Design a binder for these strands. Structure first.
Lengths: 212, 79, 122, 156, 131
RNA sequence: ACCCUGGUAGUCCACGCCGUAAACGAUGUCUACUAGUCGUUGGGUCCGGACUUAGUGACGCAGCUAACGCAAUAAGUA
RNA sequence: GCAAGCGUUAAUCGGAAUUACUGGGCGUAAAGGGAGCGUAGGUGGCUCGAUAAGUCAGAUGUGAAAUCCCCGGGCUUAACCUGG
RNA sequence: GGGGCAACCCUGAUCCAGCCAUGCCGCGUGUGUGAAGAAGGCCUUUUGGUUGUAAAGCACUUUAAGCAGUGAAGAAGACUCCGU
RNA sequence: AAACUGAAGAGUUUGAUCAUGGCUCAGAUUGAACGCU
């Protein structure tokens, strides 16, 4: 299951831009909101609490990457078992998802559209070392160092992809991804660092939330 | 093979003695070593050793219902 | 407690018994309603709470609480009984599952329908 | 250039001929986030004045703490009366695993990764004070080596 | 009566340091001298000497240290007591203050620090924690 | 009932039972160590005092305690 | 907030350091036996030796496989399977 | 695994299939774009707010399901012939 | 090379307080049942 309802509602509840809409126009004018969360009341009295700051922070990442609670808690459980910082590991494994990778490489305008592309077998993956591609309809595929991504031979003429590259160019392309627009082919050279990821997501709140 | 030492607490059976083997068992939760003791009947063929003696005994085939150890050495004797 | 005292005696926990003995460690239990009546609650509250004395298949004859507004239970009615004590009712320690066997769901319920056995309205 | 956080606010009363006089008590913890930390509580008939008075007292009840650049130097067990607190250093990325009163002091003192636990009474002021006592009694390897007259290599 | 000689030694040291005494004296023993020498070489006390008294008796005198007016021996606690002895292997010797303190260990090679016993790869009876 | 006037068991003795009290310091016993001041009891040794012992009191640090309070006769440190 | 599931009930551990070994208490909060003597037991001064049972270290044999954990490999991913 | 020299026979072990959200894991129920911010509902100080880019409209996509094809691997090469 | 990583509290006795102390809750789990779907 995935969220289907409105996305500006989510952005307004998180109080920040989650990139759920395309960058074709500024977030402020797309909604004339984000100064108040959704509903009749919006900005409220009776200020939040530590648990509210933690819950909202976890929901922020979950809504950004489009991952529900069960899969996200499996992510945190894996991250707290891998070596190093749990939040750093959780951000790395959320960034290494196939749908997020294709969104950053720019073949999709939003992560929802990137997941829609991945799910419909329009993206082939080539595992590191393997001399073959394979069509994969699973957005939650974790990509390792060196995995190649390419667009299907019967979907390179997509209009949505061609207008997704030109948005990716206007937004910026990560340095841990080597994407070529000439034949719609990227390479996941390395999982991004915490210094490469934006310094406004407090993964420490997520780690403290998953500690009762 | 499997030798065991202890004091003789009974000798009032024909060709038979009771040896008190002591051991230190450690408590699984509190870690203090309690001293525990088992009575083992041994076979003393010539019926020589008396109570209060230190004796070594080894496991063998059973001689009787409750006797499967045999005397091999009277290391110490009553003063 | 010295170490020698702990070895000689040892610290024992009492295991508390269940608060729902009539269920016999079962989630629900079937019974027949031997008496459907109303009773007054404890000191602070004031109402006519709906209760049914029900003899279960375990051999107990406990009193249970019918939740929701309005019910159809009478003598010789077969109900399913779940755990859960009513605070202001002295003696009542079980709830009647509404909508399970013979106890109907609540008529006009809309919000918490699953807790009262009400089908989703079309 | 100082960080402040209000930990608890309580409503207390005094009895008089007319009735009950209701006042407010606020406990706050101030800190630089780099090792300087302090706590204080204030009383006033109004919550904002109690909060300002607590902040003023916290700014004067301050100590300096030498952290292990993210965490503590050694396990600490401290107490103030009936609150017993225990903190131990944790690996980087662990977070401050603490209740409200412990978390306030540790986070405002700059600790990032620590394991904690409260035993005895969890009175907010006494837990804050026990955590404060432990942080002020905490030692450093350099200080221990200097006290013994050796080097940090001579004292692993 | 007195059934913990090591406990009495450490209690005398602790009370003298709490009272800010210059030195603490007691009846001597080789075990007490071993523990006192370990304290000296660890730097917790200045010196520990035995003076042979009459009637085949001896007095062990330990000169205490103070740093910035505070006692150098912050805490000195007995771990293995006569009512419950604690013997550990080489990989179970408990550390004191994350290695800043010393766990005095009685090993087959004599009284030595926890880190010394770990380096020698040998366990023993963990008699005290001094930090 | 309290108060008054009487009043029997009991209180007294001998020999036995009972085995309980707010039988209390509401503080088990034993050992070592830890500022001090002033009383008192029974000894002891020195020059009316000085010291030292074993009790028995009142204070009072450090320490302890939720607080009251304890504090060499600990509820301190073991 | 979860989501093809969501709640309720039952049951176990946790939180509970609320049986405290790790890790609690007993003047007044529950808690010192009315006091003693003493049996089993527990514990126990200094010095020089012996022994090596406890203790510690090493070696060998064993502690089945599966499971738990680590490094990998195969399922489109994952669960799952699987080598060391 | 049982019997037989074999052919082969037997095997509700086993390998499978059926049912059940009982659990775990996975995927979907669309994706972009869309304001005088439509209507309706709700609140409201009666005119604003909220539902809300949400819908409608437009532009695309077809995972899974449905239909049609194709199509590994699980098989260990029995028997028979030849040679040593 | 690795198997070496882990520890949160809250409500409720009082006019208020600190302590004691029970009760209750937030978690995880299941060969689960029931209700809605």
């Amino acid at each position: 299951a995935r969220y289907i309802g409105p996305k500006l509602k989510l952005s307004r509840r998180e109080g920040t831009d989650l990139g759920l809409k395309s960058g074709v126009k500024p977030y402020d004018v797309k909604t004339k909101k984000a100064a108040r969360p959704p509903g009749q009341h919006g900005v409220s009295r009776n200020k939040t609490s530590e648990y509210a700051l933690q819950l909202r922070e976890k929901q922020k990442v979950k809504r950004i990457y489009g991952v529900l609670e069960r899969q996200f808690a499996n992510y945190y459980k894996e991250a707290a078992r891998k070596r190093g910082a749990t939040g750093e590991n959780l951000l790395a494994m959320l960034e290494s998802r196939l749908d997020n990778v294709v969104y950053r490489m720019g073949f999709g305008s939003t992560r929802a559209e990137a997941r829609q592309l991945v799910s419909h077998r329009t993206v082939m993956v080539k595992k590191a070392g393997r001399d073959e591609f394979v069509r994969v309809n699973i957005p939650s595929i974790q990509l390792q160092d060196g995995d190649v991504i390419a667009i299907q031979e019967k979907s390179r003429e997509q209009l949505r992809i061609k207008n997704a590259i030109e948005l990716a160019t206007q937004r910026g392309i990560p340095e841990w991804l080597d994407v070529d627009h000439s034949k719609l082919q990227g390479t996941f050279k390395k999982a991004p660092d915490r210094i490469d990821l934006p310094a406004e997501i407090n993964e420490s709140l997520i780690v403290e939330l998953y500690s009762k | 093979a499997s030798v065991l030492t202890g004091r003789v607490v009974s000798d009032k059976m024909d060709k038979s003695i009771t040896v008190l083997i002591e051991r230190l068992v450690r408590h699984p939760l509190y870690g203090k070593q309690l001293r525990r003791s088992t009575k083992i009947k041994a076979h003393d063929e010539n019926n020589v050793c008396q109570q209060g003696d230190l004796v070594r005994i080894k496991e063998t085939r059973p001689i009787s219902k409750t006797k499967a150890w045999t005397l091999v050495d009277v290391v110490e004797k009553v003063e | 407690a010295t170490t020698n005292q702990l070895i000689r005696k040892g610290r024992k926990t009492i295991k508390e018994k269940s608060k729902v003995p009539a269920l016999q460690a079962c989630p629900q239990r079937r019974g027949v309603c031997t008496r459907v009546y109303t009773t007054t609650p404890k000191k602070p509250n004031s109402a006519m709470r709906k209760v049914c004395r029900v003899r279960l298949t375990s051999g107990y004859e406990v009193s249970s609480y019918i939740g929701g507004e309005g019910h159809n239970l009478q003598e010789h009615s077969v109900v399913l009984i779940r755990g859960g004590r009513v605070k202001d009712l002295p003696g009542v320690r079980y709830h009647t599952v509404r909508g399970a066997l013979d106890c109907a769901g609540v008529k006009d319920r809309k919000q918490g329908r699953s807790k009262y056995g009400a089908k989703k309205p079309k | 250039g100082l960080v402040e956080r209000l930990v608890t606010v309580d409503r207390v009363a005094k009895v008089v001929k007319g009735g009950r006089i209701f006042s407010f008590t606020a406990l706050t913890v101030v800190g630089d986030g780099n090792g300087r930390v302090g706590f204080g509580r204030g009383k006033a008939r109004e919550v904002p004045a109690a909060i300002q008075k607590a902040l003023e007292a916290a700014k004067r009840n301050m100590i300096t703490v030498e952290l292990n650049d993210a965490t503590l130097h050694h396990p600490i067990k401290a107490r103030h009366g009936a609150s017993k607190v225990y903190m131990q250093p944790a690996s980087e990325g662990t977070g401050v695993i603490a209740g409200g009163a412990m978390r306030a002091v540790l986070e405002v003192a700059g600790v990032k990764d620590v394991l904690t636990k409260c035993y005895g009474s969890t009175n907010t002021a006494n837990v804050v004070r026990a955590t404060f006592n432990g942080l002020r009694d905490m030692s450093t390897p350099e200080k221990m080596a200097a006290k013994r007259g050796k080097s940090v290599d001579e004292i692993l | 009566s007195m059934q913990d000689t090591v406990g009495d030694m450490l209690t005398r040291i602790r009370n003298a340091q709490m009272a800010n005494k210059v030195s603490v004296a007691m009846p001597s023993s080789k075990l007490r001298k071993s523990i006192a020498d370990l304290l000296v070489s660890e730097g917790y006390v200045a010196s520990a000497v035995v003076n042979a008294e009459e009637n085949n008796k001896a007095t062990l005198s330990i000169e205490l240290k103070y740093f910035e007016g505070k006692a150098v021996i912050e805490t000195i606690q007995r771990f293995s007591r006569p009512g419950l002895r604690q013997h550990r292997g080489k990989d179970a010797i408990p550390t004191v203050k994350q290695g800043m303190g010393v766990a005095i260990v009685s090993t087959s090679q004599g009284i030595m620090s926890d880190r010394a016993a770990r380096a020698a790869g040998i366990g023993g009876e963990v008699v005290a924690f001094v930090a």
